[PDB]
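A common beginner's mistake is to predict each chain separately and then try to dock the pieces by hand. The better habit, illustrated here, is to supply every component at once so that their relative placement is modeled jointly.
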Amino acid sequence: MLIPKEDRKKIHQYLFQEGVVVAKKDFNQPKHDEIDTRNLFVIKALQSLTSKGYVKTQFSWQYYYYTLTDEGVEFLRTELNIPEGILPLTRLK
Amino acid sequence: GQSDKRELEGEVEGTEDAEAELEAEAEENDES
Amino acid sequence: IHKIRITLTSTKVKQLENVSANIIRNAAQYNIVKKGPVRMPTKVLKITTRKTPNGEGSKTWDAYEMRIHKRVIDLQAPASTVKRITQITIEPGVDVEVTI
Amino acid sequence: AILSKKKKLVADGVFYAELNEFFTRELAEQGYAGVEVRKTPSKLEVIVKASNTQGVLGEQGRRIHELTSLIVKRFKLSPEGIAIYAERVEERGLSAAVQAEALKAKLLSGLPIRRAAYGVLRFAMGAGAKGVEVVISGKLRAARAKSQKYADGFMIHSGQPTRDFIDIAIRHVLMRQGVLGIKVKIMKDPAANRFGPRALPDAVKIAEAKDEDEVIPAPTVKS
Amino acid sequence: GRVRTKTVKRASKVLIERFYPKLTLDFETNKRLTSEIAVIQSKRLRNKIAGYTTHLMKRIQKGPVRGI
RNA sequence: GGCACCACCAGGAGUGGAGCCUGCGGCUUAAUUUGACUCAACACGGGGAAACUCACCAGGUCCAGACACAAUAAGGAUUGACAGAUUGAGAGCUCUUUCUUGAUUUUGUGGGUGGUGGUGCAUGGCCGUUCUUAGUUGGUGGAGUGAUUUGUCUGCUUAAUUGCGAUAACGAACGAGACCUUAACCUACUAAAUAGUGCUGCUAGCAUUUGCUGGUAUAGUCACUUCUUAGAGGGACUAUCGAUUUCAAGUCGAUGGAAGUUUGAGGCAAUAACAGGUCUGUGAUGCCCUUAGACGUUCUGGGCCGCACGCGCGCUACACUGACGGAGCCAGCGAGUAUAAGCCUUGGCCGAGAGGUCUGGGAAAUCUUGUGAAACUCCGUCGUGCUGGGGAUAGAGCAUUGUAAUUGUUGCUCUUCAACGAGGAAUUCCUAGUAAGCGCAAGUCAUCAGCUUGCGUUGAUUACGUCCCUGCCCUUUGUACACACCG
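With all components supplied together, the output reads:
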């Protein structure tokens, strides 16, 4: 699917820094909450990553549950241009 | 398990799996 | 001194009665005049469905139920004394609401 | 959002039911048993019961951190509103839940059903469970579907105690040929109960006689 | 019908075979006495158990009873 | 032999005869989707379908084809699109139009993804049936070379493999029963301004007797729980007595008792199983088909309603124990909202009505609601007439629901005044607050209940017996059957 370059980013550093993604299975929803972009944009953008082994996916209750892998952090280390040495929320302990 | 065989070893091999777990499940808790 | 009301609601009564009891005890050794607990008429939550997922066989029905019971307690006490009782008598089954 | 008392405790069940379902899918590999939601002031305690509380909350508790974060983002909850702890179950055999998925992992590895079915039955009998029955039905290398029930020990079947002493767990283990559904029925010993009744309704326990003493005719004992 | 079952028949008659003297031809005292001797989970079952117990004693008084 | 109002006796109420709602087949059809056909198909798929549901029919879009490659691509892979044409469409869907963003992305393959597509005779799970009948199994002992058998049975009794009794068996386990939920008792406890009462104030009416009936008192800063609610318990265990019987299990008549039919009604409910039903509930699935001109999806218009016909569950009725028109005026189960996308909706004000307007209360024993319901009670009109019993067919107008009511959603007003004058052969349900009448609520619901699920009002006739019909169970018996007579 076609996603603009600017909108796809807000999806990405939502998969960082509280990188667990819960999306309702409703592609016609105008906006997935806390992510100022289309709801159908959120699910598919993470579908490629969970297609190529960078995030886990879970289906239940027509509700999706995504989490950022440790292997997926390296993918986001450079593509997000984020500074080195930062652990988002789940490794803080 | 319709044969005359695979049930003698369907019990004794099965029960030693449990006998392998009673020993293990009693090791993790006592030595905690 | 303040006219304060406390409501106890739950689905199970042994949990509901326990929370009701020791709060009353907290107003026994403490000389706070008490009204309650008032046993509200129980409300049975029923829904009548069909046993058959398809539409074949005998005409037989499933009648599930929930029993929810209410206890309202009236208090004449300061806001500090009433608040600490609930956290002493907190237990997961019953939700605790306090209204002045 | 104001909700009526009828629709409030109903929502609590649906939330508990849906939350309980999510843990089963998410933490099946660790032998997850069940969830306890102890409501408490200024916190939503959620207790996860699993055989392996090391895989869950693993590598310095990474998984539990990314689990409780998966919860707050769907239930509109503040980050401080929940605190989740992991505890190991006391009796794995006595719990019909854990052994059901424990059977599921053993079933998937191609082991013969006779070896697999009895491999947990003697474990439940190892744990002291009064009875256990495992049922496997479906297809295995044959077109026709057949059932095999493997009962052991004592069984109760009808009435109110069937809810107090019997816990069940039904799972469908994925086979390449079709669906294989299983049922595991396990009873804690009535003497092992601490919450409800400690015995069967018809259990009549007679005390022994106190007689066979010697009585002397008519003395008086002054202390 | 009002036919007693075996679980109330054999449980009752063991009581006579162990505590014959302290029983009495009256239900209520027997009802209270069986409440302290045997652990009975249900009061309906105890009232069933105690009822056959007194009736057996009424039979023991009027002759020799079989099986006790 | 035994049990059974899913069998009969004796009865009651019916159905089957008319119209109508609904379903089945049949017929038609563009589709009139389809599952199911003895009990165990046919107001069943909660299946009361304008749109959606929908799987069907005639049309039109979207990729919502992830990911690894090969092709192309900055000198732009390509997406969104103003005017017009076209189309049902103000679908840039497309065609002329040359604009516009820019490596998300366009082609082919692998790989997939999704299906109310087929396969319930490839399956799970659930439900129904066997059968809610009462049946099933092992331990030690006996019989048998063994598979097996006894236990687990001539007789009585019970709702009952439930007990007595007889006994090569003795003692047990599952099922039944026990158990749980609900109904009946509690002046005996625990309390209740979200229940009531009595007092006490404050007040109003009629007789004046100081009496009788209301209202008010979230400060009268009253008492109480009898009745209303629920929590802790007690209470029944065939109790006592006459009989009958093996004097045993039990049963029948009385007495007391709240209750002496398993105290009443249900929930749960065994060993294996059925080619019983469902892939038309699941992101539950194996296989076959498709998968971009999609059998995915979306949106438009139509359909499940369509009518020469056979059948079933029912409602009105066939009149007088009745129709109306007045007057009396009593139940119980339940439901409810906030920035929604609209709940129950009072009280007032308009409207004959349906309906319309303005306020408030209730997120709930508070308010909707005492849901002041109808049968029923009393008083009159009708007077056996297809009558004023009945409301089919049909027209006109008035409203509400919803984007959208035409194939009339539904109601109301007027009008239209159909068969039906008690139902052949058959056959259904039922033993006490039961049958039969009589209404109200929750459900599917934006609207629609002649349907179910519940509740309550009035409330019976006759049995309380049997194996005559039927069905099932058990034993004996027969077998050339064991895929088990659909052999």
